Every structure is written in structure tokens, then in C-alpha cells.
Design a protein around this ligand. Structure first.
Ligand SMILES: Nc1ncnc2c1ncn2[C@@H]1O[C@H](COP(=O)(O)OP(=O)(O)OP(=O)(O)O)[C@@H](O)[C@H]1O
Ligand SMILES: Nc1ncnc2c1ncn2[C@@H]1O[C@H](COP(=O)(O)OP(=O)(O)O)[C@@H](O)[C@H]1O
Ligand SMILES: [Mg+2]
Ligand SMILES: [Mg+2]
Lengths: 578, 51, 470, 385, 234, 118
């Protein structure tokens, strides 16, 4: 590739000469130390590169070498159980050779070039292959890893490596035109991978949490945002979704978090366990980690590497969930990069194209039919931290227009220690009607009407909050006190789920349906018994209320017996007390 | 009556003024950035391409 | 060694020298003129034809005929040793105490290599600062960055001096007995005047605290690039001592607003377009390379703790300097002007102050087991009392209930005894004793945040035994 | 050059009650006085030149009116030196550079003035330096920088503006001269922000290096409540170091009285949030008393007339006596409230006029007036109810 | 101003100079400033506008040993009735006071609509006092200002709490302000002398209680207090 | 609009044109102009936005002697209840009316929430 020398150094910008033939946005190696850089200019024989690392100590005359490719990632076996930075460098292998500091100019490989993998072919010589097909399988933890021809390659095969142990560097399939296929291939992070067809959302994404699954559901392949003031509970909720959801592969992105919180999430995760198999949780997750003192170019590319990896695991047919820590810091990094380039800020300090980048990030999520004929889906959950509290912050305003679900958190409900702190008066979801045909054909025919009754009862109680503010709740009417107590029971025994608690952090669908059915039955029978006119004040202290709270902690396998017990207790109380 | 008057009249009136002042100050900063760019471009041209 | 005499342009803080491609970017040079006076400078742009040098001090007396530029080092480096404890420096390594210069064990670059995120570990131990509002409610943990937000006329310097004079560790409260552990304080000041300099020297020398401290003091009339280089040398020394000799260091950066303003001036001198509010666009990155050098490292026995101090321009928390610090640091301590005007020192406000790593350094086996619930109960009771104290001005004390009057008296007693401690040095046990003595004013049963077992063990002690010497 | 800088331990007596009592400035310290036009920055500096105890006064007219310099030339030969008995002009040096004079000479006037003030310091004197406007110096620097075609700071100023102000203010201080004597220079600089905006770069540059800060208010100047010092936004960092001198030279309990006055002002400032909400008639008597006492303090103690025959100059013991009278009245009224006496009849006592006109009593007649008013205070309240 | 200075200091004339609109002069200056790419001030005006205005205003005054005089009455329009605009600010930083007109007084039919609170005259103390106009001028002015400020403050309170909750003390100041704006400021085209103006001022101060005149010495109160306003107007 | 004009004025059709979101069009216009380094406008939008919007909205209408017609119903989303934002403001100066949706009527369940007063 083209090689040139330096003729100007001014901060992070380096002007090289002799670089005729270099392409825009390529990755260059600058200086004898070998610092990475990106070309953004072309003018005659000279090109302007922008160095990621510190340029102190460089001298005029040091060579510049181009790699000929833009920013890309290595996709292949060995990405699970790994920790990477914003530009896919393994943090564990760097520590082995260097120490507790990250010396600049270090060279490492994303995929371990010296680990043997078991190879099992699935094609024979003489076959015709096209981009996206499957040729070969590799075991990897509890998964089987499929070897894919790159989407831009078509040809005819006459070479098959027989079943044996090989590294990812060894060719396995050689085409008629001389193309050699390996176990890994590169892909630029800012170009979306092709698909056959994009499908409609018709299956729910089971978060395992009662309120998020019932009141504000998100489908498989949807997008959700969870904003709120600092100290609300975003991180624990995202970790709970990572632990208990039905997604096969989980990708976590750290876009510049604080060092101590990054240490917290780096220490906590290896101690977790996979609920599906009982093994370590890290065997199915991929971690992208950045701190505040990393180079600013590595912070901007953090969300693109994660989404490219998620799209790679989508093409193999799995279901992928992509959790992203606060994108406000990613937008701050983008603003700093734009200020480096003098981009005439528009909104507050942000570049005018912030919404385009946010849309390009969120549009990759969906349920598609892959080029190999299989079906895969990607779900994206992102966090926002508006500093002013109000949702008029420009990043929040740009995010609100391209998301389907919106799980707003509130700090005041955290002060009452009611967790999760979901504001049910501000949150909304647009996926309910599409998920309704799935609900009635699988869960229960009466599920949507029961859910609407629960939501209507929650809405009625919010309309009485003015009268409670003037006069005490005891002076209110018996029916109004009834609906207030029903709302309180619904909140404290249906919307509560403690995440630090060991058995309060998960809830299935059948348990929630049974709890809603019991609550509606109790409400209707108590409403009739009030007009019955017997023991109207002692209705609030019936022994059935113990059975309502007991269903929160009953096991799923023991759930039908306790459901029958609670229903027949409701019958024996309301029918035959008086 | 006093609580309702304060809640419905005064607070949005102050908030709108705050928003208006913020927009004016931000527009002035956006205006002066353009002049700084122009004078930097004038500095670059005369100090490097004259002879 | 080699000199360059091809000066072609001098204007303000910049001078151009031709045929100087041998110089490396960011190098330090010495400028010599006809009278023999030697100044300093930094290379900020290298090209094929000329190099640009920004000059320390002023450029009075220079001419194109006799000025010469010679090289010192390609990289700004500092020579460090364990002999620096008890010394003072002017921000660029030059001693100002009159003592002979040090001998270095090593020479290290002042720029900071980032810590590997997989090499860090979780903070677990706390630092006793001797201040009740910090030790009890806003606990400082070994490995935390806890900035202090102060006003214009508020005594931030006195609080910093008191913390540096009183800070210590408590091995006897941890584990089976722990072990002897060294401790040192690294003090860095930026843009101070003569009065502050004399006050700091007098405070540090009068009580023996200098024997365990290193001071990097930079005056207001000093060159601005020394202000930029000032905190990085202090952090280099702190990292060297902590991660090579197993020390527990505490780093105090006296004023960060001066650092940000000097950074703005340096950026404006090099023709860079400003960012959001006139400040440079890379100010978030620049502040991150300073704060994130603190922490604790897995496998190493030392630690680094940071207490930045910054002045809000108009008590405005939406200003960029306090705004960007909140995205990198863990909590804040906010001084109160109302408490300062009422004669209370230190005027630390308990309500807007917060520490995020507090819950990991308290409990059983570290400090005392009742710490967190006592802190929460104090917070809630003070929050009730401050609102009742303003409701009294409308409705009077006669219309109150009895428990509201209990809260009203508790708030005044809190402000009189818990906060207004003066120049005293209080251990954690004494602060907990006073905290329980204040809570005994409230009747048992209103303490909803505290378990019955702790109330049955610590409630009921009279305040009269401390009333004789508050 | 000097031999050694010294810590400040002696107050700089300006003759104004609010500055001398609530926001003191030491002999070697620096102060700043910002405010909009028509607020009183020049009358304060001229009163400081007239009445302070400095041996030599240097006045710098950097970019101001010529009539303000003609007044000094005409009036000062007639006045009398407070500490020598001679003509007042024999101790004053004037540097005049008016607004219609050439722009480039504004910096040179400031440097010449500070050099002369440093020269008189080396002879053992205590010199006071008044800078009439430091904003005109920054405006001249901006005007010159437009010809050089540099890239400017936030408001068009050159980037090195904050270094010049720092290098100018750090020339003050109490030193030991090269001849072994003791001298001191104190600097009081006035700042004229455009449109009264305190976020101006000059004001924020000055705010970080000065030890005292006397912010002025346009609203108080509109209602002719001079000196119009904004008590909420003013501070002084020399309060603690000057306490040993006050105990020895004025009274043993003077800091306690000053702290009580400041505490009363803070309490009055706190209650004004409620008066704006529900009016003054919704407060209890214990708060109405605080409101009225704060009003009495503001109208009697803080207010001062610079053109009056007697009110222009006020010694320390006179201010101490007035503060003692006000606190005695407050302590009488606070106990009289608890006896069931309503406030609306306490304010009608004739001793209110006695306190309110203690300003105009001459200095030599004050020791009798104070002792009569103190007995009248005691006699007024015991027969109240 | 060249002609005015020549006439004043070469032939002992007394010259009055009137400038119709300095806003137009500032706009004409801004055109050349923007054409030459000068560094702007606060709102696009050139940074040397303070110096340029200083060379115009500072040519008035009197000269020792000469009988001539120059008096200037510039007229300028605050654009959005704004006192913080660069032109009024830089004008007030140079001149020796200002007379500010009020639109609120104009909407009530009062002529001339001079608002006394933002107005100022720096050279007032030189020309008033004993032996020049009268011995009670300055104290009367101070008392009028102090009473009118309280009247405006009570006006700002009656719009919040209603006038039915007022005491008599606040009502007296409210009535004083209401009568002041109608009788003192509102004069039409008549030519009041100084004695008539002082008579009206002392008549207005008689509405207030005698003991509330803190800024007036008791001799002047004993000499002039007690005049009734109905003897002059009605 | 080119297709609609052709159909209406060369085949006598009655064509109704709906533009789904003009806020995205204005944002895309701001992104293009800001990269060409020209002076911005009220909120960073280019100063020629009125002319560019007028070249779109003014293509509707009827023509004498022809049976066809073109009708436009643009839909735009305000950032707030801010009627003074540059996009709805400059839309108001060119178009011939407006239909404003009410959040209060939507909150209490009225559908469609058209507010008759603005
Ligand atoms: N202490 C005081 N006592 C009496 N009158 C005062 C006092 N201070 C100010 N004044 C009055 O207020 C006027 C303020 O004018 P001054 O020359 O002090 O203005 P300034 O605020 O310094 O403005 P600038 O110099 O920017 O024009 C004085 O002329 C005088 O009439
Ligand atoms: N489900 C939950 N169970 C218990 N505590 C919770 C839960 N959700 C939130 N919290 C509390 O909310 C606080 C905020 O947590 P975290 O997400 O780490 O910070 P932030 O919300 O600012 O990102 C935590 O202290 C945690 O105790
Ligand atoms: Mg978080
Ligand atoms: Mg003046």
C-alpha cells in the first residue's frame, strides 16, 4: 500500500506527503512507534490523518503506512467470553504482556490466532456457494458456531479440509477462482449487513419482569429506551434483562462509563450464573468496555462494533439482545469529534447530523430472514441520562421519535423504595396491538381484557389524587376507599419486583395472569359485598388478602395448587361469610 | 385560590421567559462562531499564499 | 548542545524558528537572548520549514539578531524519589524551600498512561477525615474521586488545610487487626495568591504535617503553561508512591476553575475554535485524563484518592465546569453560604451533598455496624426539621403538634453541634456518639429507619456529657 | 524587588461604615468595586482618597471624564489632611488620561501609576492606589488587537488579558523593603461591565484574584440609597485576620457585635421570601420585629451621605456605639414581645427617632449622645407595660 | 461642534447644541466598521465605538479665564425601550447624567413623560444650595425620591394582596404617588419657575406625616411644612 | 409533486398529495447547508429555508381552462407546543391555514383531538 512521510505535526492532526493513492477514511499507521490514525482529507500529493493516541515525541520525517481498509472488525469464533474496547482490542491479553497500564502502540489480535478449533465440513467439492450460506460447524461452549461465506463472495468449490483441529488462520475452502475462505472475515462497522427480507414484529420479548411484560411490552426485534435522572436504577434493570431474558446471545456496550462502575460490572458478571443451563453467564455474552480516559475515537465507534457483532450473531440464526449503557456520553464524544472538525453546531453544541446517526444506529434492530434461509432477530435497549430532568434534552428528543417503547423512570418512587421505579403515567408502548393475536392464541383468551381491566383500575386511582390532597383518605367514600385500597394492593403486590432479592427478580407469564385473575375476582366480589351491606369495614381485613400476597412468592410448579386454593378461598369467603 | 393561581399562572410564565433568554444567548454564540471561522480563514490565506 | 538562530517572527507569546525540523513535537526548549537571560518554551507545531514555540513568561527584550533556541528534552519528564516527602516545588519540579535539590531514582513522563479496566478492583475501605458531616453522612472511600463545590467567598482553603492536616487511616477498625500502613498527602495548588501561599505554608509547617506531605504551589503571576503542567506532576508522584512503594496517598487539587480558564487561554492562543460556551471542545477529555488517574489496582497494595476543589462561577450548577465534573466523579460535597453567614464552620450542607461509593466502605468489619441506618435517619429528620422551621414563620409554634416541635428543636441542635465543630478533630466513634446523642431527643418509635436491636443498644445517652465541651 | 512579603494584620480605614465594619480590607490587600453606570464607583473612590489614613494617595484616571479630574484639582487644595493638618493636595499624585485622549496611552497610565506607588512604598510609606476604570484598559487592548489581526477570546479580548490583570494586582502587599523598613501598597480597582452584566470576562478575571469584593446595585442607586452596596453579593476574606487588632484597638467584644449584625441581616434576608408570597401582614410578631429591625439597620447604620457636613466621615467607635444601640433596642424589644406587647405600639416609641438621627451627631458630641440614648432605651421599655 | 467651540471660546457666546439622533450616527459607524472587518462589540457595533463617541461628547464644558460655555442635549432612541443596549450604555458611561422618558406615563396622558427614578444629574450638587437657589433644595429632592420609591413598591404589592388589606401607612404613600404623578410631573406647556416648583413640592410633602420626613432637617420642616395642595389646584 | 402536477394538468385527474413529515425534511436541509459553511438562521436552520419551502408548497392549486386540481395536506410534528419554532412558523406563512391537534383532548380520550380554537 502507499507509504509516505510526515511533513507537519500540529496536535492530533498530522499532514503526510507522498500519499497519492490513499483512500478516504482508511486506517493508517503513523510514526516508528506505530500509532493508528484516520485519513480525512485529500489534496494533491498530501493527506490529512488524525491520530487516536498521544502524538508527543513525534518528529518530522517519520514514515506513514496505510492499511488500505476503513475501520472494521474481525468476526469469527472466539468472540464469546471476551472483553473488548471500542475498537475490538482484547483487554485480557494486553494485560498479560504489558501490565496494569496500556502502553501506546501495542499490537494485539481480536481472535486468538493460536487456539485449535474442531472443524466439521458440510460441503463437498463441485458445489456452488453464494454469500450468506453455511459451510462448516464449530463447537463453542453450549453453542455450535457456523462458518459463513462473506456476503460479497460467490463462487464454486473444489477444496474441503477434512475433519480436524485447525486455527482460524488456516484456509478451509478454496474456490475455483483462487478465493480462499477462512474461519473469520472482516467487515466495516458503518455498513449494515445485507438480508433477504424484513419481517413484522409478532412475538414478544420476554423480559422476565411483570410490569414491563404486561403493561409496556416490547416485541422481538423492537427498540426501547429507559431514561431518567441519576440514581434511578437503569443499570440494575439492564443487568436483570441480561440475566433473565430469553435472548440467546447478549451484547453489552459501555460507552464511556465511570471507572468504578465499569469495575463493578466487570467484577459482578463472572460471578453470575446462566438460568437456562446453570453454567457461567459469560459463556453467552460479549462485553465492550470503555472508560472516560480512553481515546475519543474509540468511544464513538463503541456502539457500531457492538451492533455489527449483534448482526453477525443474527445471521447465524440466534436471537440477540443489545444492551447499551447511556448514549448521552456517546453523543458527548460525537460532539467533541465534531468540535475537532469545526462543524458549526446547531442544537446546543451538538452537530446537525446527530439525529441521522441515532436513526442509523436504531434502524439495524429487527426480525429478518437471513441469506442462508434461517430467521434471526436483534433487539436494542438503550439508556438516556437527561441532565435537566425534563425530556426536552436534544438527545432524548431525537431518541423519542425512533423508538417503540419508552420506559421512563422516576426518582421519587425510588425514595419510597418501590422498585422498579417505573412511571406508569409517562411510559408507553406501541407493540400491544400486534402482540395481542399472539397473546390470546398462546397465553389465554381473556388475557387482553384482564390486562385492560388492570390498567383501567390503575387509571381510576390516579384520578382521586386531588381529593386525597385536600382531605384525608379516611373521610373518603366507602367505594372510593375501596378502589384506593384495590389500587394500593395492585401496586404493592403486582408492580413490585426487587432485583437484589434472590427470588423476587423473576416472574413468568402464567404467574402474572393468575395474579391478575385473582385480583379482579377479589375486586368484583368485594364491590358486590359492599352493596351487600355486611361487615363493610371488615372487608379490608379479610384473610384472602394474605393469599393475594402469597402468590407473589409461590413457585411456578406449585402455582396451580395455590391458584386453586386462592380461588376457592375467595369463593368460600365471599359466597358464605354472611 | 392562591395555590391554584401560582400553579397555573406564574410558573409557566417564568419558564417561557427562561426558554426565550436561553435561545437568544445560544443564537448569539452561534453567530460569533461564524465570525471566528471567517477571521481564521482570512489569517490562513494571507499568511501562507502571499509572496 | 545544538542551537538554532534562524528566528523570523516574534509576536506576543509565539516565535517562529526556521530550519528546526530536528525538534520533536511537544519538546521543551530554552530561549537565550543578548543579555544572557534564559526563558523557557514549548514546541507546539513542527513543519518542514519552521517550528512554532510558545514562550513562558514574557517576550520583552527579544530581537531577531541575537535570539537563539536550544533543546532540553523531547518529552517533559519529572525526576521522582522517596526523598520528596517534606519538600516544596513550584509546579515544574524546581524546589523553592532553599533546601538542596533531590536526587532522582527514576525520571518519568508527566503524561498519564490509562489504567487497564480489567486490572482495577472495587474500593472497600474508608478514610477518616475528622469531619462529622463527611465521616458519617458522606463517607470517603479509598479510591474515590469526591469533588468539593464551593462558592466565591466561602472558606475552601481552610477546609482543604484542615482535611490535609487531619486525614488518617484506621487499621484497628478493619479485620483481625490489619497491618502498619504508610500514608502521604500530595498537595497541588493552581493560581493562588501570596496570601494563600503564606497561609498554606504556615498551616503546614506549624503542626508537623509537612513531614508527610509534598506541595506543588503555583502562583497567580506565574506562566500559564506551568498551571497546565502542575496537576500532572502531582498525579505522577502520587501514582509512583502508591503503586511502587505501597503508600496510601491523598491528592488535593486546590482550584480547578483556574486550570480550566488557563486551558481556555492556551487553546485560544493556538487558534482553536472554542466549544459550547467559549471553553475548548476537548475539555471533557482533558478533565478525564486527570480524574481517572485515581483508583485502586488489583494485586497492588497501595491506593490513590482524589479530592478536587472547584469554585462555581455564580453558584451555578449548569455551568460547564461543574457540569462536566459530575459525569466523571462520584458525588459531591456542597458548601452552604447560609450556614457560613450564620457563623458555622465548616459550612457543609448535608442535603445536596452525596457520595455514591459510601455503602461499600461501611458495615461490619469496617467502621461500625450501625453507620448506614444512622446516616439515613439523620438525613430524614433534618429534612423534616428544615421545612418545619419555615412553616413556623407562618403558623407559629402554638399551632404545631408536639412531634413537630421535637423536629424543630432537633434541627437547631443538629446545626449547633453536629455541623459546627470548629477546628476540632473528631474520630468516627465520637461522631457516632454525638449522632446517637442527637437522635435521643426524638422519642423511640419515630425512628422508622433504624432496627430495634440497634435502638436497644445505643439509644438513651444524654447530650449533657458532651454539652460541657461541644 | 523587595526582601520579604508579610502577612496582613492592620486594617485600611476608609471612613465608610459598611466597608469598615462588614467587609474590611487590610493594609496590604486588594479590592474590587464593580457596578453599572450611575451607581457610585467614583464618589466612593474620591471619599477614600479624602478620608483614608494612607500617607500617600495615587489616583489613576484611566479613561474617564475630565470634570472628575478637574474636581480633584479644584477642591483638594482647600481640604485638610486628616493625619497631618496640611493641605490635602500635598499628599496626592494624579495621573490623568481622559476618554478623548489617544487610546494606546491607557495601559501606560496604569503601569506608571503602579510603578510610582511601588516607589513610594520603598521609603516606608503606606500607599493607596485607586484605579478609576480597568475596563477601559481591556477595551484599549481589544482596540489595538484588531489591528494585529489575532484570534480573540470570548468577547473579542486578547487571550493574554487575564495575565496582565494578575500581574498588576500581585504588585500590592505589605513588604519589608531592601532598606529594612516596612511599607505597604493597597489597590482598589473599579470595573465597569457593559450593561451591568457580571458574567463579563473582566469581572470574572478580577473575581478570582482579589481579597475583597464590593458589588454595587442599580436598584438601590435608583431609590437614592447610597452607597448602594449589595450586601448579598459582597464578601471580604480579611475578616478573620483582623480580629486581634479590633479587640485591642476598638473594643473587646466588637467581633461579636459584628457577627450579631450579620446574623440579623441574614435572618431578615431569609424572611423576605415569605413577604413576597403572602405580604408583610401574614407574619407573627417575632418576625415582624426582625423585619423592622432590619429596616432600621438598613436606613440608619448602612446608609451614609458623602456630601453632608458630618455624615461624610465616621470613626470606628461611632459605628461601635451605633451597633451597640441597635442591639440594645433589639434585645429590649425581643423581651417586651414575650410580655404580650404588640409590635405596632413598640415602633411608635420616641426612641426610634433618637436612634435614626445618631448619624448626624458630631464626633466630639457623640460620647454624651450615646450615654443619653442608652439610658433612654432602658427607661422607655420598663414603663411600656 | 467645531462651530460651537469657535463661537464659545473666541467670541464669548453661550452655545446650546442639540443632536437629533445618535442612533443614526451609530448605524453609519457600524456600516463602515462591518465593511472593514473590524472586531465587533456586543451587538455587531465596532469595538472602538466608545472612543468615537468620546471625541464628540467631551467637547463641551467651560474654560478657566473665558466667559463662553458649551451645553449639549443629545437625543437618542433606545430601540426596544432597552437601557442595556450598547448605544445607551456607552452614552451613559460618558455623559454627566440622562433624562429618561417613560411610555407608561405617556399612555396615561401625562406630558412631559419624564420618569424620575432612572433619571440622573451628576452635576446637581454644584449648582444648588444656599446662596444659589435656596437652602432646602437638596433635602426636598432626596425626600421626594425616597417617598416615591415607597409608593412604587406599595403599588407592586397591591397587585398581589389587594388594596383592602393595606394599612393607613401604605395607603398614604400610595395616595402620595398617585397625586405626585398627576400634579408634579404633569404640567403641560406652562413655564413654572423654581419657586412654584418648590411650593408644589412642599405642598405634596405635607400629605405625609410630619415625623416621617427623615431626610429633611427639622428647621426646614418647621419653616415650610403645612401647605395645602387645594390652594393651587382643583 | 412532479408526478402529481403531470397527472392533474395532463390527464384531468384530481390528485391529493400527503407529505408525511416535513420536520425530517427541514432537518435534512439543515444538515446539507451546514456542511457548505454559510450563515445560519433562527435556530441553526439555513436562511433560505422560506424559499425552499415555498418552492414545494406553492406547486398546488388549479389552472384556468383545465379540469384538474392538486391538493396538499402536509403533516409536521412540532418539537413542543412551541408555535414559534421556525418550521411551523415558516409553514404558516406559506400555507393557507392549519389544523392543530390538542394534547388535552387526547389525554382525556377524545379522538380525533382537533382543537377548534387555533
Ligand atoms: N455616597 C454617596 N452619597 C451621596 N450621593 C452619592 C453617593 N454615591 C453616589 N452618589 C450620587 O450618585 C452619583 C453617581 O455618580 P458617579 O460619578 O459616582 O458614577 P459612577 O457609578 O462611578 O459611574 P461612571 O464613572 O461609570 O460614570 C453621584 O454623582 C451622586 O450624585
Ligand atoms: N429493582 C431494584 N431493586 C433494588 N434497588 C434498586 C432497583 N432498581 C433500582 N434500585 C436502586 O436505584 C439506585 C440506582 O442504581 P444505578 O442504576 O446503579 O444508578 P443509575 O440509576 O443512576 O444508573 C441503586 O442504588 C439501587 O439501589
Ligand atoms: Mg448508572
Ligand atoms: Mg465616574
Amino acid at each position: 500500500m502507499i507509504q509516505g512521510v510526515i511533513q507537519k505535526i500540529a496536535g492530533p492532526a498530522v499532514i503526510a506527503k507522498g500519499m497519492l493513492g490513499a483512500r478516504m477514511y482508511d486506517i493508517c499507521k503513523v510514526g516508528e512507534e506505530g500509532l493508528v490514525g484516520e485519513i480525512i482529507r485529500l489534496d494533491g500529493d498530501t493527506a490529512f490523518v488524525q491520530v487516536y493516541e498521544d502524538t508527543s515525541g513525534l518528529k518530522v520525517g517519520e514514515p506513514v503506512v496505510s492499511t488500505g481498509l476503513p475501520l472494521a472488525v474481525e468476526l469469527g469464533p472466539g468472540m464469546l467470553n471476551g472483553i473488548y474496547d471500542g475498537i475490538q482490542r482484547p483487554l485480557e491479553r494486553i494485560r498479560e504482556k504489558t501490565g496494569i497500564y496500556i502502553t501506546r502502540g501495542v499490537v494485539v489480535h481480536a481472535l486468538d490466532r493460536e487456539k485449535k478449533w474442531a472443524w466439521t465440513p458440510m460441503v463437498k467439492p463441485g458445489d456452488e456457494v453464494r454469500g450468506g450460506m453455511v459451510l462448516g460447524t464449530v463447537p463453542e461452549f453450549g453453542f455450535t458456531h457456523k462458518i459463513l461465506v462473506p456476503p460479497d463472495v460467490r463462487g464454486r468449490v473444489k477444496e474441503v479440509k477434512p475433519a480436524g483441529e485447525y486455527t482460524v488462520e488456516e484456509p478451509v475452502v478454496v474456490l475455483e477462482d483462487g478465493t480462499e475462505l477462512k474461519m473469520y472475515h472482516t467487515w466495516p462497522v458503518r455498513r449494515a449487513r445485507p438480508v433477504q427480507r424484513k419481517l413484522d414484529p409478532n412475538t414478544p420479548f420476554l423480559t422476565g419482569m411483570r410490569i414491563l411484560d404486561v403493561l409496556f411490552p416490547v416485541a422481538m426485534g423492537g427498540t426501547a429506551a429507559i431514561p431518567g435522572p441519576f440514581g434511578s436504577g437503569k443499570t440494575v434493570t439492564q443487568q436483570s434483562l441480561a440475566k433473565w431474558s430469553n435472548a440467546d446471545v447478549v451484547v453489552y456496550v459501555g460507552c464511556g462509563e465511570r471507572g468504578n462502575e465499569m469495575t463493578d460490572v466487570l467484577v459482578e458478571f463472572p460471578e453470575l450464573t446462566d438460568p437456562k443451563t446453570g453454567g457461567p453467564l459469560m459463556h453467552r455474552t460479549v462485553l465492550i468496555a470503555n472508560t472516560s480516559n480512553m481515546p475519543v475515537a474509540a468511544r464513538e465507534a463503541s456502539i457500531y462494533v457492538g451492533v455489527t457483532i449483534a448482526e453477525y450473531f443474527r445471521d447465524q440464526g440466534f436471537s440477540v439482545a443489545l444492551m447499551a449503557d447511556s448514549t448521552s456520553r456517546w453523543a458527548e464524544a460525537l460532539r467533541e469529534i465534531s468540535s475537532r472538525l469545526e462543524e458549526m453546531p446547531a442544537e446546543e453544541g451538538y452537530p446537525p447530523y446527530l439525529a441521522a446517526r441515532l436513526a442509523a444506529f436504531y434502524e439495524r434492530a429487527g426480525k429478518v430472514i437471513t441469506l442462508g434461509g434461517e430467521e434471526g432477530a436483534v433487539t436494542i435497549v438503550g439508556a438516556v441520562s437527561p441532565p435537566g430532568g425534563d425530556m426536552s434534552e436534544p438527545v432524548t428528543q431525537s431518541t423519542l421519535r425512533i423508538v417503540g417503547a419508552f420506559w421512563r423512570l422516576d426518582a421519587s418512587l425510588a425514595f419510597r423504595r418501590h422498585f422498579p421505579a417505573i412511571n406508569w403515567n409517562g411510559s408507553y408502548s406501541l407493540f400491544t396491538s400486534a402482540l395481542d393475536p399472539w397473546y390470546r392464541e398462546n397465553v389465554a383468551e381473556d388475557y387482553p381484557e384482564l390486562r385492560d381491566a388492570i390498567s383501567e383500575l390503575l387509571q381510576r386511582e390516579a384520578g382521586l389524587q386531588e381529593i386525597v390532597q385536600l382531605v384525608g383518605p379516611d373521610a373518603l367514600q366507602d367505594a372510593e376507599r375501596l378502589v384506593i385500597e384495590v389500587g394500593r394492593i395492585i401496586r404493592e403486590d403486582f408492580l413490585q419486583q426487587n432485583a437484589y432479592h434472590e427470588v423476587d427478580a423473576y416472574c413468568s407469564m402464567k404467574k402474572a395472569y393468575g395474579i391478575m385473575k385473582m385480583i379482579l375476582a377479589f375486586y368484583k366480589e368485594a364491590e358486590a359485598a359492599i352493596k351487600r351491606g355486611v361487615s363493610i369495614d371488615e372487608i379490608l381485613q379479610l384473610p384472602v388478602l394474605e393469599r393475594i400476597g402469597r402468590a407473589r412468592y409461590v413457585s411456578e410448579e406449585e402455582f396451580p395448587a395455590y391458584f386453586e386454593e386462592a380461588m376457592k378461598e375467595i369463593q368460600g369467603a365471599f359466597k358464605a361469610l354472611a | 385560590r392562591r395555590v391554584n393561581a401560582l400553579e397555573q399562572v406564574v410558573i409557566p410564565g417564568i419558564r417561557a421567559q427562561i426558554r426565550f433568554i436561553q435561545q437568544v444567548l445560544e443564537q448569539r454564540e452561534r453567530e460569533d462562531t461564524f465570525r471566528l471561522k471567517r477571521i481564521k480563514g482570512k489569517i490562513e490565506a494571507r499568511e501562507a499564499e502571499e509572496e | 548542545k545544538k542551537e538554532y538562530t534562524g528566528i523570523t517572527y516574534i509576536s506576543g507569546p509565539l516565535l517562529f524558528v526556521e530550519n528546526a525540523k530536528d525538534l520533536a513535537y511537544g519538546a521543551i526548549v530554552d530561549i537565550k537572548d543578548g543579555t544572557g537571560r534564559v526563558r523557557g518554551g514549548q514546541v507546539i507545531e513542527v513543519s518542514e520549514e519552521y517550528a512554532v514555540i510558545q514562550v513562558f513568561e514574557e517576550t520583552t527584550g527579544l530581537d531577531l539578531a541575537t535570539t537563539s533556541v536550544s533543546l532540553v528534552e523531547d518529552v517533559a519528564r519529572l525526576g521522582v524519589s522517596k526523598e520528596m516527602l517534606g519538600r516544596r516545588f513550584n509546579g515544574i519540579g524546581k524546589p523553592i524551600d532553599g533546601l538542596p535539590p533531590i536526587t532522582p531514582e527514576k525520571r518519568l513522563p508527566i503524561t498519564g498512561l490509562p489504567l487497564n479496566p480489567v486490572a482495577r478492583r472495587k474500593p472497600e475501605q474508608f478514610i477518616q477525615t475528622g469531619i462529622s458531616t463527611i465521616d458519617v453522612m458522606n463517607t470517603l472511600v479509598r479510591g474515590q474521586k469526591l469533588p468539593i463545590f464551593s462558592g466565591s467567598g466561602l472558606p475552601a482553603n481552610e477546609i482543604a488545610a484542615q482535611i490535609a492536616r487531619q486525614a488518617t487511616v484506621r487499621p484497628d477498625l478493619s479485620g483481625e487487626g490489619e497491618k502498619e500502613e504508610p500514608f502521604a498527602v500530595v498537595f497541588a495548588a493552581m493560581g493562588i495568591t501570596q496570601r494563600e501561599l503564606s497561609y498554606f505554608i504556615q498551616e503546614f509547617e506549624r503542626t508537623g504535617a509537612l513531614s508527610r506531605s509534598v506541595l506543588f504551589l503555583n502562583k497567580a503571576d506565574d506562566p500559564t503553561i506551568e498551571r497546565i503542567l502542575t496537576p500532572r506532576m502531582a498525579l505522577t508522584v502520587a501514582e509512583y508512591l502508591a503503586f511502587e512503594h505501597d503508600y496510601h496517598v491523598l491528592v488535593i487539587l486546590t482550584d480547578m476553575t483556574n486550570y480550566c480558564e488557563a486551558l481556555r487561554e492556551i487553546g485560544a492562543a493556538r487558534e482553536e475554535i472554542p466549544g459550547r460556551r467559549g471553553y475548548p471542545g476537548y475539555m471533557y477529555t482533558d478533565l478525564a485524563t486527570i480524574y481517572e488517574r485515581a483508583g485502586v489496582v488489583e494485586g497492588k497494595k497501595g491506593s490513590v484518592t482524589q479530592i478536587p476543589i472547584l469554585s462555581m462561577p455564580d453558584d451555578d450548577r449548569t455551568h460547564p465546569i461543574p457540569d462536566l465534573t459530575g459525569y466523571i466523579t462520584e458525588g459531591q460535597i456542597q458548601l452552604s453560604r447560609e450556614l457560613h453567614r450564620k457563623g458555622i464552620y465548616p459550612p457543609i450542607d448535608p442535603l445536596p451533598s452525596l457520595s455514591r461509593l459510601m455503602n461499600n466502605g461501611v458495615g461490619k468489619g469496617k467502621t461500625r455496624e450501625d453507620h448506614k441506618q444512622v446516616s439515613d435517619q439523620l438525613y430524614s429528620a433534618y429534612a423534616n426539621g428544615v421545612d418545619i422551621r419555615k412553616l413556623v414563620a407562618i403558623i407559629g409554634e402554638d399551632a404545631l403538634t408536639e412531634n413537630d416541635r421535637r423536629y424543630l428543636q432537633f434541627a437547631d441542635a443538629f446545626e449547633r453541634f453536629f455541623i459546627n465543630q470548629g477546628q476540632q478533630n473528631r474520630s468516627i466513634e465520637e461522631s457516632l456518639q454525638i449522632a446517637w446523642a442527637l437522635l435521643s431527643m426524638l422519642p423511640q418509635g419515630e425512628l422508622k429507619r433504624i432496627s430495634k436491636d440497634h435502638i436497644g443498644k445505643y439509644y438513651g445517652q444524654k447530650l449533657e456529657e458532651i454539652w460541657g465541651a461541644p
